[PDB]
């Protein structure tokens, strides 16, 4: 900074403290009352959702490896397993609706052969709607999946 008359060397250290710290101390995170930082991946207008977050491989897959001592990953507020559940409760619905129809088919048609045609009719029709909606740009949305069911 300066050299005062008597060759006394004024340094930046003498006039001011110097520590390696944050560039902005406005916000601070405490995971369950314990200090920490992280990431808040916000989506893009139009992005694929369970595809952005499902990709990976990644996410951060090759960011869960060379970490030093103590550094670990942990997951709060996560969309993922809600998807995993709504698919699973509709594909459950689907199969229940087949089995339950297969009984009503038997109850009226004592013919086993006959409780078999309609059982083996709609399996095909379902797939067609996956082949048709994929071709129209639609997805396995919350909507289109209850549309299989409805």
């Amino acid at each position: 900074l300066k050299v005062n008359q008597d060759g006394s060397r004024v340094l930046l250290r003498d006039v001011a403290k110097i520590e390696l710290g944050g560039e902005n101390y406005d916000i601070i995170a405490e995971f369950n009352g314990q200090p920490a930082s992280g990431l808040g991946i916000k989506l893009a207008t139009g992005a694929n959702a369970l595809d952005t977050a499902a990709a990976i491989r990644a996410e951060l897959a090759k960011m869960e490896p060379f970490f030093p001592s103590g550094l670990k990953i942990v997951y709060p507020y996560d969309t993922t397993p809600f998807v995993k559940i709504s698919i699973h409760e509709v594909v459950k619905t689907l199969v229940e609706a087949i089995i339950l129809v297969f009984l009503v088919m038997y109850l009226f048609l004592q013919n086993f052969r006959a409780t078999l045609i309609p059982t083996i009719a709609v399996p095909v029709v379902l797939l067609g709607t996956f082949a048709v909606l994929a071709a129209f740009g639609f997805s396995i949305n919350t909507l289109t999946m209850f549309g299989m069911v409805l």
Binding site: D26, A29, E30, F31, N32, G38, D78
Partner: peptide
Amino acid sequence: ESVFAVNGFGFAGRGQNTGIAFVS
């Protein structure tokens, strides 16, 4: 299962007035 508190970040905007806890 787990919280994730954050002092100084509202969804109004930000500053030392605001905050938010992310639950799981």
